[PDB]
Amino acid sequence: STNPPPPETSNPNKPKRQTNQLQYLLRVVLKTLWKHQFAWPFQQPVDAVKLNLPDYYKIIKTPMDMGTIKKRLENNYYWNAQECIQDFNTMFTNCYIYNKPGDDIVLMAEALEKLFLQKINELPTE
Numbered sequence: 001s002t003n004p005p006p007p008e009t010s011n012p013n014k015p016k017r018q019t020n021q022l023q024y025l026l027r028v029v030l031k032t033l034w035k036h037q038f039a040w041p042f043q044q045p046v047d048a049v050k051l052n053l054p055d056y057y058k059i060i061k062t063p064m065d066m067g068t069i070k071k072r073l074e075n076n077y078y079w080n081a082q083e084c085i086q087d088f089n090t091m092f093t094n095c096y097i098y099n100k101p102g103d104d105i106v107l108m109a110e111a112l113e114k115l116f117l118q119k120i121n122e123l124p125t126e
């Protein structure tokens with residue numbers, strides 16, 4: 001049928017910021033995940049039309065993807081690291097909620113999440 005509008009990657013009314021933690025999220029965390037062999041299905045919003053998932057956006061009401069996260073980081077959309085971490089967690093959780101356990105897309109998300117947790121374990125202070 002139709003996809004929703006994608007999550008915003010900028011907003012004129014939302015205060016913008018750069019912190020060293022946000023810089024680390026973009027240059028270390030996002031970059032490491034983006035190049036992973038399993039990253040590509042997560043590099044843009046789920047196209048429920050092209051993927052023939054007519055119920056995807058009936059079930060997933062807070063969609064999130066790494067393409068959106070990357071642009072948010074590039075645009076200084078976030079005020080703090082927690083906002084960005086929340087977006088990553090939402091992306092993984094959506095995949096686990098929508099898809100059958102043990103599906104390939106779930107295994108891909110699980111591998112990306114393990115790597116994500118490894119990199120955020122070293123998030124610098126401040």
Ligand SMILES: CN(C)C(=O)c1cccc(-c2cn(C)c(=O)c3[nH]ccc23)c1
Binds near residue numbers: 040041053094099105
């Ligand atoms: C063979 N693959 C993995 C694909 O053609 C492809 C491509 C683009 C996106 C997605 C996809 C992403 N996400 C996050 C899902 O939860 C999901 N469920 C079913 C498909 C997807 C799958």
